[PDB]
Ligand binder design. Structure first.
Ligand SMILES: O=C(O)/C=C/c1c[nH]c2ccccc12
Length: 168
């Protein structure tokens, strides 16, 4: 059984825990819980391949940065989810960019940049900015939301494919 080691990156307000639980047990939690250390091991039949998807929900802060480097070198796939509710989440991408680039010891690595909470009326971050930026690195941008739950599964299924392509 293929055991994929992935980690999610973001900040407080994104709601990465609400996105994970929605795909772990198909449930949407409204309450925001401060996640510090949570690992999700769920079996997914990706294109017919029943594999295990281990997802570690990291804190949306910079308090455990010394511990970040630990799984940052172990995780192959980086789930980058930014909220269009804040333009800062679109700026912090540069921080993680140079951060991952260093710890990964490579300029390339299977990463996906997706937007969350697009169903919110506060569209501070427009799709053109996201698409153009995504096109700079050549990464697929997927509009997602656990509130409306549209194309969420697609993002996960195609994500694994990128990991496969980075190997074979
Ligand atoms: O060290 C532990 O006890 C757990 C580590 C991890 C659990 N899920 C992960 C996903 C990517 C990288 C590391 C992990």
């Amino acid at each position: 059984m293929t055991e994929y080691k992935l980690v999610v990156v973001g900040a407080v307000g994104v709601g990465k825990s609400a996105l994970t639980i929605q795909l772990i047990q198909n449930h949407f939690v409204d309450e925001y819980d401060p996640t510090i250390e949570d690992s999700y091991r769920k079996q997914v039949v990706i294109d017919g391949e029943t594999c295990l998807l281990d997802i570690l929900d990291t804190a949306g802060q910079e308090e455990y940065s010394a511990m970040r480097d630990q799984y940052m070198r172990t995780g192959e796939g980086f789930l980058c989810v930014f909220a269009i509710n804040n333009t800062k989440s679109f700026e912090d991408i540069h921080h993680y960019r140079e951060q991952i680039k260093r710890v990964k010891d490579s300029e390339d690595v299977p990463m996906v940049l997706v937007g969350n909470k697009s169903d919110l009326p506060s569209r501070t971050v427009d799709t053109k900015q996201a698409q153009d930026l995504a096109r700079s690195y050549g990464i697929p941008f997927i509009e997602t939301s656990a509130k409306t739950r549209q194309g969420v599964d697609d993002a996960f299924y195609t994500l694994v494919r990128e990991i496969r392509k980075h190997k074979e």
